[PDB]
């Protein structure tokens, strides 16, 4: 219902098709936060 850009369209498509399934992905605001932190001299990333 929010900034998951690649997931909003998929959920809408699944709802119209009658599936009612969710592909969560990752919010866009967290990416914005990571970019804003990296704009300072602070390294930050996600490991595996």
């Amino acid at each position: 219902k929010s900034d998951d850009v690649n997931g909003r369209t998929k959920m809408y498509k699944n709802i119209v098709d009658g599936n009612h399934q969710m592909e969560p992905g990752m919010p866009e605001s967290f990416n914005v936060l990571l970019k804003e932190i990296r704009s300072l001299g602070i390294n930050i990333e996600l490991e595996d």
């Binding site: 914005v32 970019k35 804003e36 990296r38 704009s39 001299g41």
Partner: protein
Amino acid sequence: TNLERQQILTEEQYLDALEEFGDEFDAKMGAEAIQALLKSMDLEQECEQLREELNETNSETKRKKLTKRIKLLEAFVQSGNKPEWMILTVLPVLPPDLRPL
């Protein structure tokens, strides 16, 4: 020269000290000075000296204000970060679409 490693030397005393000692008491006045002091030290030797002093001398004020320093040194050497990295040289910029018109 008869001068400490880290002492404040205002302009007039700098002029007279340079005039008397010649070109030996090298001094700087900017972030390059701080970077030079930060880069030109060894961490392990200072950590060993701090640990020895904390183990030997004990007092109400000596037991504190030194454990924090030795913990900072230990975290700094284990985490891998160099000390001169605190004085940045290159400045990154935000992507333009995150700061729109």
